[PDB]
Scaffold this active site. Structure first.
Site, PDB file in Angstrom:
ATOM      1  N   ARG A 176       0.728  -1.563   0.252  1.00  0.00           N
ATOM      2  CA  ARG A 176       0.286  -0.585  -0.086  1.00  0.00           C
ATOM      3  C   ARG A 176       0.852   1.033  -0.007  1.00  0.00           C
ATOM      4  O   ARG A 176       1.845   1.004   1.155  1.00  0.00           O
ATOM      5  CB  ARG A 176      -1.183  -0.251   1.095  1.00  0.00           C
ATOM      6  CG  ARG A 176      -1.752   1.353   1.416  1.00  0.00           C
ATOM      7  CD  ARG A 176      -2.392   1.112   2.517  1.00  0.00           C
ATOM      8  NE  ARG A 176      -2.879   2.989   2.624  1.00  0.00           N
ATOM      9  CZ  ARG A 176      -2.877   4.082   3.783  1.00  0.00           C
ATOM     10  NH1 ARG A 176      -2.678   3.279   4.886  1.00  0.00           N
ATOM     11  NH2 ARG A 176      -4.412   5.012   3.984  1.00  0.00           N
ATOM     12  N   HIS A 228      -3.296  10.855   0.394  1.00  0.00           N
ATOM     13  CA  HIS A 228      -2.733  10.829   2.029  1.00  0.00           C
ATOM     14  C   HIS A 228      -2.403  12.198   2.740  1.00  0.00           C
ATOM     15  O   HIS A 228      -1.107  12.342   2.866  1.00  0.00           O
ATOM     16  CB  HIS A 228      -1.719   9.180   1.265  1.00  0.00           C
ATOM     17  CG  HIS A 228      -1.539   9.024   2.987  1.00  0.00           C
ATOM     18  ND1 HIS A 228      -1.174   7.751   3.676  1.00  0.00           N
ATOM     19  CD2 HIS A 228      -0.461   9.761   4.942  1.00  0.00           C
ATOM     20  CE1 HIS A 228      -1.234   7.896   4.563  1.00  0.00           C
ATOM     21  NE2 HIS A 228      -0.795   8.738   5.281  1.00  0.00           N
ATOM     22  N   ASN A 268      -7.128   8.833   2.763  1.00  0.00           N
ATOM     23  CA  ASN A 268      -6.288   8.363   4.341  1.00  0.00           C
ATOM     24  C   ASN A 268      -6.419   9.127   5.146  1.00  0.00           C
ATOM     25  O   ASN A 268      -6.027  10.155   5.821  1.00  0.00           O
ATOM     26  CB  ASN A 268      -5.167   8.337   3.754  1.00  0.00           C
ATOM     27  CG  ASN A 268      -4.293   7.577   5.367  1.00  0.00           C
ATOM     28  OD1 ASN A 268      -4.370   6.541   5.541  1.00  0.00           O
ATOM     29  ND2 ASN A 268      -3.874   8.480   6.123  1.00  0.00           N
ATOM     30  N   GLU A 269      -7.511   8.791   6.364  1.00  0.00           N
ATOM     31  CA  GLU A 269      -8.273   8.976   7.646  1.00  0.00           C
ATOM     32  C   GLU A 269      -8.393  10.943   7.403  1.00  0.00           C
ATOM     33  O   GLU A 269      -8.030  11.771   7.908  1.00  0.00           O
ATOM     34  CB  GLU A 269      -7.113   9.028   8.814  1.00  0.00           C
ATOM     35  CG  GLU A 269      -6.371   7.946   8.957  1.00  0.00           C
ATOM     36  CD  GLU A 269      -5.197   7.811   9.537  1.00  0.00           C
ATOM     37  OE1 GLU A 269      -4.208   8.906   9.856  1.00  0.00           O
ATOM     38  OE2 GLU A 269      -5.203   6.524  10.224  1.00  0.00           O
ATOM     39  N   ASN A 302      -7.269   1.283   9.649  1.00  0.00           N
ATOM     40  CA  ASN A 302      -5.947   2.138  10.324  1.00  0.00           C
ATOM     41  C   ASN A 302      -6.431   2.044  11.544  1.00  0.00           C
ATOM     42  O   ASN A 302      -6.720   3.044  12.719  1.00  0.00           O
ATOM     43  CB  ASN A 302      -4.907   3.618  10.022  1.00  0.00           C
ATOM     44  CG  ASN A 302      -4.658   3.981   8.459  1.00  0.00           C
ATOM     45  OD1 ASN A 302      -4.732   2.909   7.929  1.00  0.00           O
ATOM     46  ND2 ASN A 302      -4.590   4.986   8.288  1.00  0.00           N
ATOM     47  N   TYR A 320      -3.338   1.292  16.078  1.00  0.00           N
ATOM     48  CA  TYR A 320      -2.833   0.779  16.352  1.00  0.00           C
ATOM     49  C   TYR A 320      -2.808   1.111  18.130  1.00  0.00           C
ATOM     50  O   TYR A 320      -2.135   0.475  19.044  1.00  0.00           O
ATOM     51  CB  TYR A 320      -2.131   3.008  16.553  1.00  0.00           C
ATOM     52  CG  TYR A 320      -1.703   2.718  14.791  1.00  0.00           C
ATOM     53  CD1 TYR A 320      -0.214   2.470  14.686  1.00  0.00           C
ATOM     54  CD2 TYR A 320      -2.306   3.527  14.311  1.00  0.00           C
ATOM     55  CE1 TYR A 320       0.489   2.563  13.435  1.00  0.00           C
ATOM     56  CE2 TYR A 320      -1.673   3.448  12.551  1.00  0.00           C
ATOM     57  CZ  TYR A 320      -0.268   3.075  12.715  1.00  0.00           C
ATOM     58  OH  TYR A 320       0.353   2.830  10.920  1.00  0.00           O
ATOM     59  N   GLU A 376      -3.089  -0.436   8.169  1.00  0.00           N
ATOM     60  CA  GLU A 376      -2.226   0.327   8.663  1.00  0.00           C
ATOM     61  C   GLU A 376      -2.618  -0.323  10.510  1.00  0.00           C
ATOM     62  O   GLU A 376      -3.356  -0.200  10.861  1.00  0.00           O
ATOM     63  CB  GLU A 376      -2.589   1.664   8.824  1.00  0.00           C
ATOM     64  CG  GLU A 376      -1.981   2.742   7.835  1.00  0.00           C
ATOM     65  CD  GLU A 376      -1.325   4.465   7.976  1.00  0.00           C
ATOM     66  OE1 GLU A 376      -1.210   4.584   6.911  1.00  0.00           O
ATOM     67  OE2 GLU A 376      -0.963   4.819   9.347  1.00  0.00           O
ATOM     68  N   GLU A 379       8.153  11.120  10.150  1.00  0.00           N
ATOM     69  CA  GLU A 379       6.471  11.383  10.743  1.00  0.00           C
ATOM     70  C   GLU A 379       5.691  12.497  11.035  1.00  0.00           C
ATOM     71  O   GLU A 379       5.535  12.923  12.380  1.00  0.00           O
ATOM     72  CB  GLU A 379       6.744  10.537  12.315  1.00  0.00           C
ATOM     73  CG  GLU A 379       5.235  10.082  13.268  1.00  0.00           C
ATOM     74  CD  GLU A 379       4.643   9.088  12.162  1.00  0.00           C
ATOM     75  OE1 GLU A 379       3.392   9.883  12.683  1.00  0.00           O
ATOM     76  OE2 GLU A 379       5.077   8.702  11.869  1.00  0.00           O
ATOM     77  N   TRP A 380       5.484  13.105   9.744  1.00  0.00           N
ATOM     78  CA  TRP A 380       4.581  14.582  10.588  1.00  0.00           C
ATOM     79  C   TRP A 380       5.393  15.339  10.780  1.00  0.00           C
ATOM     80  O   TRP A 380       6.516  15.628  11.175  1.00  0.00           O
ATOM     81  CB  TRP A 380       3.248  14.299  10.112  1.00  0.00           C
ATOM     82  CG  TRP A 380       3.022  13.273   9.053  1.00  0.00           C
ATOM     83  CD1 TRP A 380       1.985  12.032   9.294  1.00  0.00           C
ATOM     84  CD2 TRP A 380       2.419  13.168   8.004  1.00  0.00           C
ATOM     85  NE1 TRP A 380       1.864  11.381   8.436  1.00  0.00           N
ATOM     86  CE2 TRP A 380       2.477  12.701   7.200  1.00  0.00           C
ATOM     87  CE3 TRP A 380       2.548  14.160   6.707  1.00  0.00           C
ATOM     88  CZ2 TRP A 380       1.745  11.533   5.907  1.00  0.00           C
ATOM     89  CZ3 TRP A 380       2.224  14.391   5.852  1.00  0.00           C
ATOM     90  CH2 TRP A 380       1.845  12.979   5.142  1.00  0.00           C
TER      91      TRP A 380
END
Ligand SMILES: O=C1O[C@H](CO)[C@@H](O)[C@H](O)[C@H]1O
Length: 459
Positions: A74, A120, A166-167, A296, A298, A362, A419-420
């Protein structure tokens, strides 16, 4: 117990997080390129200017995926590489399209199924300057639909698994609610408006796909929504209600419209006029607009009533129980703790609630303080292996035992990456990356996942 032979597993990445080459081959700026030039916005003052240099090292990444034995991969398309300025009347960039076409063809030659995320978070900056991006209903919908159409035409004969967004929760809350993510807006209105327009842009792209491409290309299209598993802090009515309210503000406000046909009750009552109203034709378009449930996830959170943040639904979430016990192993980010059971409960919940096959697009873990470790120590990522051990087991139980329809699992991420707002300090890869040499070194978690899915997917 084994997952059916049709089950797909692999890894996930996002364009801005790994590509680099921000202005190569005609690419123009995205709102994230702009955001990273604003002081104080990125923790370590970094940007995606280089990242893992995956735009140039795309071949190497494919070989890495192949060496891991993945069944799928992906990744996302940088909108501003395909249509630099982003608009339906703006010049199309052949070189950008060719780049992704070639990448996809390499995946095909290697027998790896591509799962493509259209959006994204990297909205072309020109669209933000032109009309405020997602803030403008008709322009945003028409431009995204045109973009989706161009993607279906350019890659659709090789891609059969599409993800529109995406989200949208992150896109709206972080980008327009608290300004932590690009474009850095802060408002009690824009996040809800942006969310509304994205739900509509999504629905238009899906109707376009189903009507003009699905039959000939034989693929499916869905949306990826993020969600933790939520548990009441205690058994009081206030806590149980707060948990339901929290689920609405995180997931329900997107999933109920897309899968059931209406915004949920609590949020409409709380946001009032700030939450736009769908017209009868829009509701019809939006209802049932996702072929599969992209998820997604976590961690798990405990929910208490009494929050002051409206963006969270006026609830307090944490990983500390009333008796002081923590939910699980700490990661590099405070909010994320290892809690496999929650993953199992969430998969069942989603299947029952929305009745669409679930694809975990994810799931991963950032080892606490891993950025400080030299490669030889980083590869022995014990906590990440334990995380995947707990979560893959939860996945196996949910499907083969519980009966939840889950058909895919993608680990975040193939590589340590940008990571942003946290910059490069937070490491999520199953593959270590030395940013000074771009050398890729598989971590032990990569061996675990390859071996686990090989042994747990029907031959
Ligand atoms: O949900 C996510 O979590 C990942 C880790 O926080 C992040 O890198 C991805 O861009 C995002 O889609």
């Amino acid at each position: 117990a084994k997952l059916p032979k049709s089950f797909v597993w692999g890894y996930a990445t996002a364009a801005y997080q790994i590509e680099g080459s921000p202005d190569k081959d005609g690419r123009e700026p995205s709102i994230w390129d702009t955001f990273c030039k604003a002081p104080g916005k990125i923790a370590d003052g970094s940007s995606g200017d280089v990242a893992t240099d995956s735009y140039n090292r795309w071949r190497e990444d494919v070989q890495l995926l192949k060496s891991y034995g993945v069944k799928a991969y992906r990744f996302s398309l940088s909108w501003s590489r395909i249509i630099p300025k982003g608009g339906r009347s703006d010049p199309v960039n052949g070189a950008g399209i060719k780049h992704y076409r070639t990448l996809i063809e390499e995946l095909v030659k290697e027998g790896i199924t591509p799962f493509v995320t259209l959006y994204h978070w990297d909205l072309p900056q020109a669209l933000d300057d032109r009309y405020g991006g997602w803030l403008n209903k008709e322009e945003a919908i028409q431009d995204f639909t045109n973009y989706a159409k161009l993607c279906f035409e350019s890659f659709g004969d090789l891609v059969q698994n599409w993800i529109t967004f995406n989200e949208p929760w992150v896109i709206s809350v972080m980008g327009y609610g608290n300004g932590i993510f690009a474009p850095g807006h802060v408002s009690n209105t824009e996040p809800w408006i942006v969310s509304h327009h994205i739900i509509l842009a999504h629905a238009h792209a899906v109707k376009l796909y189903r009507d003009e491409f699905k039959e000939k290309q034989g693929g499916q299209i869905g949306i990826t929504l993020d969600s933790h598993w939520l548990i009441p802090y205690d058994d009081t009515d206030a806590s149980k209600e707060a948990t339901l309210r929290a689920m609405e503000f995180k997931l329900g406000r997107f999933a109920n419209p897309i899968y059931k046909g209406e915004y949920p009750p609590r949020i409409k009552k709380i946001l009032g006029d700030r939450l736009p109203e769908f017209t009868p034709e829009e509701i019809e378009l939006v209802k049932g607009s996702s072929d599969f449930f992209g998820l997604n996830t976590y961690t798990t959170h405990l929910v208490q009533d009494g929050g002051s943040d409206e963006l969270a639904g006026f609830v307090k979430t944490g990983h500390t129980r009333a008796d002081g016990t923590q939910l699980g192993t700490q990661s590099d980010m405070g909010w994320l703790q290892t809690y496999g059971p929650g993953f199992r409960w969430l998969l069942n919940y989603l299947w029952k609630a929305y009745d669409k096959p679930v694809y975990v697009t994810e799931n991963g873990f950032p080892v606490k303080g891993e950025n400080d470790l030299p490669v030889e120590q980083a590869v022995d990522d014990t906590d990440r292996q334990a995380y995947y051990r707990d979560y893959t087991e939860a996945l196996l139980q949910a499907v083969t035992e519980d009966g939840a329809d889950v058909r895919g699992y993608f680990g975040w991420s193939l590589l340590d990456n940008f990571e942003w707002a946290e910059g490069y300090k937070v490491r999520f890869g199953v593959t270590h990356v030395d940013y000074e040499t771009q050398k890729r070194t598989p971590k032990k978690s990569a061996e675990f996942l390859s071996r686990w899915f090989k042994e747990h997917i029907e031959e």
